[PDB]
Amino acid sequence: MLKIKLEKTTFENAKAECSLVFIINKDFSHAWVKNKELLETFKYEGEGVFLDQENKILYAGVKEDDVHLLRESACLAVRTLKKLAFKSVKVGVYTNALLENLKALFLGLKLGLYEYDTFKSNKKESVLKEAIVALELHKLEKSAKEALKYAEIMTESLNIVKDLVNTPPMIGTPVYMAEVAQKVAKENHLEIHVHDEKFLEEKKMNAFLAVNKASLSVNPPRLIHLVYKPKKAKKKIALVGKGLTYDCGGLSLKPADYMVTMKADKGGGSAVIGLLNALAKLGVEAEVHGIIGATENMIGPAAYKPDDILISKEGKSIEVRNTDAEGRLVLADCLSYAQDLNPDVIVDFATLTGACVVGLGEFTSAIMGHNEELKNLFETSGLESGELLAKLPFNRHLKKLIESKIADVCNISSSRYGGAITAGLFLNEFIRDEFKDKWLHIDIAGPAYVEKEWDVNSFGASGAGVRACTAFVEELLKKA
Amino acid sequence: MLKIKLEKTTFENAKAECSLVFIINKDFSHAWVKNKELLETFKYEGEGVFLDQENKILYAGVKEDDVHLLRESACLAVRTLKKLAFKSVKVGVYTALLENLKALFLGLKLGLYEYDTFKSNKKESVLKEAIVALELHSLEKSAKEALKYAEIMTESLNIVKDLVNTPPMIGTPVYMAEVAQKVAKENHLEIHVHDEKFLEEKKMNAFLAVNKASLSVNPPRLIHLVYKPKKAKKKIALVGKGLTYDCGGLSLKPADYMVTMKADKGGGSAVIGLLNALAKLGVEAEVHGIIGATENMIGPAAYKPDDILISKEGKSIEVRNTDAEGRLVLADCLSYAQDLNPDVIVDFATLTGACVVGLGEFTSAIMGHNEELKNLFETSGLESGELLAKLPFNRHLKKLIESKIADVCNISSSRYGGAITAGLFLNEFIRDEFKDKWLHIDIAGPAYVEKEWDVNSFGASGAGVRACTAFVEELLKKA
Amino acid sequence: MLKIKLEKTTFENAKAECSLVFIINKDFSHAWVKNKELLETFKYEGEGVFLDQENKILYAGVKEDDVHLLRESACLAVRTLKKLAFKSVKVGVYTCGAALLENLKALFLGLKLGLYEYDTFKSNKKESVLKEAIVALELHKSLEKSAKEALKYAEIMTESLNIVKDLVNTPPMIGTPVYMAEVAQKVAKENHLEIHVHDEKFLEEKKMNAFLAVNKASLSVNPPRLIHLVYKPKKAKKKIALVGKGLTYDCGGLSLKPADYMVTMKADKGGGSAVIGLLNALAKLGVEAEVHGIIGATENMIGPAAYKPDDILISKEGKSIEVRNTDAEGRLVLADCLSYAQDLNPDVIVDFATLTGACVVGLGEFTSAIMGHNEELKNLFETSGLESGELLAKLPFNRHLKKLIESKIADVCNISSSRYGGAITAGLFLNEFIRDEFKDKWLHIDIAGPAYVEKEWDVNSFGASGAGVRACTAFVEELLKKA
Numbered sequence A: 001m002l003k004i005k006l007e008k009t010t011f012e013n014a015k016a017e018c019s020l021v022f023i024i025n026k027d028f029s030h031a032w033v034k035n036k037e038l039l040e041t042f043k044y045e046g047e048g049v050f051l052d053q054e055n056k057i058l059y060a061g062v063k064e065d066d067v068h069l070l071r072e073s074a075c076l077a078v079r080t081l082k083k084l085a086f087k088s089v090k091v092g093v094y095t096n097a098l099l100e101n102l103k104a105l106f107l108g109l110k111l112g113l114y115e116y117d118t119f120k121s122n123k124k125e126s127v128l129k130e131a132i133v134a135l136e137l138h139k140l141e142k143s144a145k146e147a148l149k150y151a152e153i154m155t156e157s158l159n160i161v162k163d164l165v166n167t168p169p170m171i172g173t174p175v176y177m178a179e180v181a182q183k184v185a186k187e188n189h190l191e192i193h194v195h196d197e198k199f200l201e202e203k204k205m206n207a208f209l210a211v212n213k214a215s216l217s218v219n220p221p222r223l224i225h226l227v228y229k230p231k232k233a234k235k236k237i238a239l240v241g242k243g244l245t246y247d248c249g250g251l252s253l254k255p256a257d258y259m260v261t262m263k264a265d266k267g268g269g270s271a272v273i274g275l276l277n278a279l280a281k282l283g284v285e286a287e288v289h290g291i292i293g294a295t296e297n298m299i300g301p302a303a304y305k306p307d308d309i310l311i312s313k314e315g316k317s318i319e320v321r322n323t324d325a326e327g328r329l330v331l332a333d334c335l336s337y338a339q340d341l342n343p344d345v346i347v348d349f350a351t352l353t354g355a356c357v358v359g360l361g362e363f364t365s366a367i368m369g370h371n372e373e374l375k376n377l378f379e380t381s382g383l384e385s386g387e388l389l390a391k392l393p394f395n396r397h398l399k400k401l402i403e404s405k406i407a408d409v410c411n412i413s414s415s416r417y418g419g420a421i422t423a424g425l426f427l428n429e430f431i432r433d434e435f436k437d438k439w440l441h442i443d444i445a446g447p448a449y450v451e452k453e454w455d456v457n458s459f460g461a462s463g464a465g466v467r468a469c470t471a472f473v474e475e476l477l478k479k480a
Numbered sequence B: 001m002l003k004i005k006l007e008k009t010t011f012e013n014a015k016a017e018c019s020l021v022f023i024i025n026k027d028f029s030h031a032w033v034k035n036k037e038l039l040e041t042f043k044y045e046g047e048g049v050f051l052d053q054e055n056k057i058l059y060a061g062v063k064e065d066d067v068h069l070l071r072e073s074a075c076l077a078v079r080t081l082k083k084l085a086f087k088s089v090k091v092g093v094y095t096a097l098l099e100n101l102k103a104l105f106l107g108l109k110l111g112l113y114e115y116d117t118f119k120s121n122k123k124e125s126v127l128k129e130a131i132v133a134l135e136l137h138s139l140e141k142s143a144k145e146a147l148k149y150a151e152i153m154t155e156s157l158n159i160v161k162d163l164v165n166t167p168p169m170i171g172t173p174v175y176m177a178e179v180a181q182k183v184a185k186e187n188h189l190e191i192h193v194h195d196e197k198f199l200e201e202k203k204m205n206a207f208l209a210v211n212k213a214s215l216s217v218n219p220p221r222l223i224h225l226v227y228k229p230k231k232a233k234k235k236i237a238l239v240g241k242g243l244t245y246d247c248g249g250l251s252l253k254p255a256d257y258m259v260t261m262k263a264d265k266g267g268g269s270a271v272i273g274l275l276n277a278l279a280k281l282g283v284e285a286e287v288h289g290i291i292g293a294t295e296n297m298i299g300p301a302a303y304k305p306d307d308i309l310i311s312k313e314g315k316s317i318e319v320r321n322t323d324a325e326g327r328l329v330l331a332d333c334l335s336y337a338q339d340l341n342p343d344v345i346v347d348f349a350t351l352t353g354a355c356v357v358g359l360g361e362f363t364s365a366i367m368g369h370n371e372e373l374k375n376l377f378e379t380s381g382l383e384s385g386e387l388l389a390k391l392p393f394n395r396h397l398k399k400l401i402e403s404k405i406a407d408v409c410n411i412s413s414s415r416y417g418g419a420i421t422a423g424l425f426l427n428e429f430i431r432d433e434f435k436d437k438w439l440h441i442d443i444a445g446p447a448y449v450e451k452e453w454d455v456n457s458f459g460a461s462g463a464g465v466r467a468c469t470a471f472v473e474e475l476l477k478k479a
Numbered sequence C: 001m002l003k004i005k006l007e008k009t010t011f012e013n014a015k016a017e018c019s020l021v022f023i024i025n026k027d028f029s030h031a032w033v034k035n036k037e038l039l040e041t042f043k044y045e046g047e048g049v050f051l052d053q054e055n056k057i058l059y060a061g062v063k064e065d066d067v068h069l070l071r072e073s074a075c076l077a078v079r080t081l082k083k084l085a086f087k088s089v090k091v092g093v094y095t096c097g098a099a100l101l102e103n104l105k106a107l108f109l110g111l112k113l114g115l116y117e118y119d120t121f122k123s124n125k126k127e128s129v130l131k132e133a134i135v136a137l138e139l140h141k142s143l144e145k146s147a148k149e150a151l152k153y154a155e156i157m158t159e160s161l162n163i164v165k166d167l168v169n170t171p172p173m174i175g176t177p178v179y180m181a182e183v184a185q186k187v188a189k190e191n192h193l194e195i196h197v198h199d200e201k202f203l204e205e206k207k208m209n210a211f212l213a214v215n216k217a218s219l220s221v222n223p224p225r226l227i228h229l230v231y232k233p234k235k236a237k238k239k240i241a242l243v244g245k246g247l248t249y250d251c252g253g254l255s256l257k258p259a260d261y262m263v264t265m266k267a268d269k270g271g272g273s274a275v276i277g278l279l280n281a282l283a284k285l286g287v288e289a290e291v292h293g294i295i296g297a298t299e300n301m302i303g304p305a306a307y308k309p310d311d312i313l314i315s316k317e318g319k320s321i322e323v324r325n326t327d328a329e330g331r332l333v334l335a336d337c338l339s340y341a342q343d344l345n346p347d348v349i350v351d352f353a354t355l356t357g358a359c360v361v362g363l364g365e366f367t368s369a370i371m372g373h374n375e376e377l378k379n380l381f382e383t384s385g386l387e388s389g390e391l392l393a394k395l396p397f398n399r400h401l402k403k404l405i406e407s408k409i410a411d412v413c414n415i416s417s418s419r420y421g422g423a424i425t426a427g428l429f430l431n432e433f434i435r436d437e438f439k440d441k442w443l444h445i446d447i448a449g450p451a452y453v454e455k456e457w458d459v460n461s462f463g464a465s466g467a468g469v470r471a472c473t474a475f476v477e478e479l480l481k482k483a
């Protein structure tokens, strides 16, 4: 809740309790650097932050003239000030290019306040409450206002997602996800449907139901369906999300080291809820459907099993060989329900595979699908939004590794290599021909939840997928 | 090899002891399908091969009208006929025309390859020739061009494959050098073969560290091939990991992961084959092939987790795992490569398991800074029939190879991003003035695979050779 | 080194390019807190350091009035100042809960230790501008004589510690057993000590086959060294033998260590290294005792000549040893070196070894284990050692543990038959090689935890700590007091 006040005034004349000045690429020459000697004395060379005490100026380093590094720096700056006693900070303006840099600056600043400290007995309300932005170029009023609108909506949407994903699993049940979705629907006047295991049975979503069987009597599943219907709809978009509120691996039980952080296996479903908040408040011209399959994957005497053969809603049978490959079962059924809506575009988000993380690192999501133009659009837009992405290619050799001797498809690969992609090729088996060129699969298993601070993300949930998909939709609608 | 004869005749008039007919996308309607009824009776629907016994016609299915699937079926067809009694097969011409003809002739030829040297039941094939009727399903010009590529590329691939398949007691660093010597003699190439004393003079201590355990058994070799044509539009350095065996070192591999490590020399072998291909194709570029050859063995002299190595470039390396040895060898070989002032540097290595986990066994990773250069390699490589993907660097991953007691650590602090942090390790040894001239290709996946797939027999594939050849040809076009 | 200058003046009139003031227990009331308002505005509440830029004052928090936290904070202050542009810092004299002498020692040693870091191989490494601390002889709450005594201790102990740390931090390709002998030779030359460096033939003649078995794998690459340093003062009240495990690298042998466990094994020479540093310290402190430093140096490598599970070795002492795991090699080298040590007929024998993983599992990374039979001797080492700033714990033998190192085909086994009590059963194994006439004169110190830690803690930088040197030094001094 960092308020940003835009003011038609010079940086020098603007009034706040302290000052923020960015040092881009180690350039200390600007007028705003009031006491350069002080920096020399204490050897500040532009890496990280430095507080001039006398002048009450916080300097924040930006290693290269780069919009993404500016976003990071702004976040680090406000993180720093949050611990101090200044109620307000003033900052000059740093910079299509102008709009993107103002978005980065304002979003950066606002995300600086976030941390998941709900359970800390020492949590303190920040004194820092406002950033005063002097509308004057470091090197317009229309752009600032637009950027500020984005920053407020995106900050709110990301923090919704981050709060949901960070919520511990005894609390963050499938029912709890549905409640978060209800608030978002009520806030934006959206249509929402919340289906239970009875609906799932009716629609023959037996893959989804299988995953939930261990825990049905404790925490029943929810299929959550949000709809944003605007005045003008240029496209119909289905966003499909894995809402595994806890994943212990089922009977194929995860080792202890790997079960921690599995409250974040609802990262994909949570991003979809945040995406409907963001896309509705931005008022995009598209009918957007947010579909979340929510359940735990627990172990117990009613668990689904290695050797079970499940009949998916689409009709294809699935040999289960490992119950820890559960996200793709839930997704198989949720994608089927999505396709019944006849959307122009389907994007699914999932913390699907460990192999993705092994391949791309913790900070980068994978993009899969058939339509290269579509995959490129999502990548380019996503990269610009500040998310790290990489396309991973299908091939015919990988496709063969998910065959089953006794079912239509196996829920794991016969090889220990290519897991993220064979997982995407599993999902493909349930994408109808007439949707294969309209479909994107985004595996956010890495950056959805990371146990350290990085970029604009505090320890834990990051809200991965939200910015990227928002940018993707906006660019898509520009062509439409 | 498979002799391919180009004849200006109709398919019908051409003569051979059997016929090969491709069935594209289940189209059985063509005149060359002599007896449709037979195929109906025996339920042949165009998947794989089917042999018309009376007419002596082998049908080979191509699932889609696709040049790469054609290359695959052509290989399967010859594999099938290799076990039969026909000395010759005739085939029509299938169709851009150039790539199709290249795919056809290459695929046909590769169908004969099997690593069967140590098999006691091996017989010589009866099949010697494919008669190609120059008739579509000038032409002769394109055909003669595709056949020249096919012959050079088959030869080049089989050089790489025989070398990679050679078991480690035989395929020593010295053995690699001898193979490189042969290629240089056949191609009138300049060649230098340096030993551990040269390494020592050049202060290539990361390289030497990996070899220390086994120095007294099989000494290391730095192999330097040079192709220098009449006209050189570019200077190109090709740099290969030549680990002729990798047991992991003191960080010993589990038994399950040590099998196939004779193929840790896949990158170095690719480079040897590339100089064969690029010299015989007569490309207008000066090409240097640089191969760092050694084993990574375990013993009382092995370099150790906790060793801190001074690279030739001068940066220090904290060793935390002796099974990340390839990047040490390459660190020094890249430094040697850069002294040559090349316009382009590409390295090939079977570098990381994480690459394989990430992309699957059939696909190589492309890393670097220059997007235009990576894109050229990717696009040309895919067209050559190799599977590739670009993997992106980022600033977060770069932090993971930091060391508290050296300039860089030879492993990442994270379990995640292995192939890429290995790429970022290599990057610390690429001078600023070469960072935009550099490609890193991780072929740990497709270099060696324990089954047949596409045009590849069990074992070595020759991965990297086709993709880099196409990359070079495309590159010189723009120069 | 950080030059310390003692000056007879007030803190205020002393001159330096910056000041250091400790803030104890969040009390900001002292006159040396020049601008108290500044600290409030920027929410400095006494945790860690805070720099008053305008006044050039570094505050360093000391959570309680405690001599050990003072030592830690001093170190932090100088670590912080090392990265700045000040050539000199001035500080006053602090007397926390120790006494004046121990507080002076803490302050001066902490300050000096703040400069250490193992950065030899770093390319970015730069010399620090910070060269001196000006100590103004004025109490925060004979002073000069005590300060001179504390300064000498801090000077000798800093030097001794950094010798151990440089040696332990040295990577294994370089830090061979021969390299260990060379460092010992330098120490000997510097201090005019007797030194003997025995090779594998001496080991052979003395029938030290446990020692030799460990070395067999790597004999042809790096021959072993038995290092024997001797400090002989005019007046010696006691003969003290210090015995150290000098495994310059331990890959585990044929019982190969997992990869994640083989890293840091350059530090398996921590015990031997501490003994080398201990002779430097004790000679320069001029202690009144004949001190022997015995170091068994070798690698424990894998190879075709490596000693094996099922090998049965005849120790120098005569007892046969069933080997069931080659990664329990330190106790074999120590069996033979302890035997050698007892041949000196010392009054006290202390061995130091990075001996067991179980010790670390038991006490944590920061604490050493003390074993032996003589409770009073054990207590002297513990108390002395704690006061010196090392963390320590006595671990008790018992008869049930002793049975677990029995062998069906030899006199003793080099591992226990149980997964439990590893550090203690290793100590009981050592005991089998301690003659009856030395059982009440023997201490075994397992420094497997603190000798090497992969982070900064207390006064120790990433890596080697020099664990054991401060503790043993204090123990010898206390011992000689009563003698």
Ligand code: NA
Binding pocket: A362, A445, A446, A447, A448, A449, A450
């Ligand atoms: Na994650």
Ligand code: NA
Binding pocket: B443, B444, B445, B446, B447, B448, B449
């Ligand atoms: Na492979």
Ligand code: NA
Binding pocket: C365, C447, C448, C449, C450, C451, C452, C453
């Ligand atoms: Na330790």
Ligand SMILES: [Zn+2]
Binding pocket: A247, A249, A297, A323, A324, A325, A326, A327
């Ligand atoms: Zn799972």
Ligand SMILES: [Zn+2]
Binding pocket: A244, A247, A265, A324, A326, A327, A351, A352
């Ligand atoms: Zn899951």
Ligand SMILES: [Zn+2]
Binding pocket: B246, B248, B322, B323, B324, B325, B326
């Ligand atoms: Zn390796």
Ligand SMILES: [Zn+2]
Binding pocket: B243, B246, B264, B323, B325, B326, B350, B351
């Ligand atoms: Zn390797």
Ligand SMILES: [Zn+2]
Binding pocket: C250, C252, C326, C327, C328, C329, C330
């Ligand atoms: Zn050991």
Ligand SMILES: [Zn+2]
Binding pocket: C247, C250, C268, C327, C329, C330, C354, C355
């Ligand atoms: Zn040891």
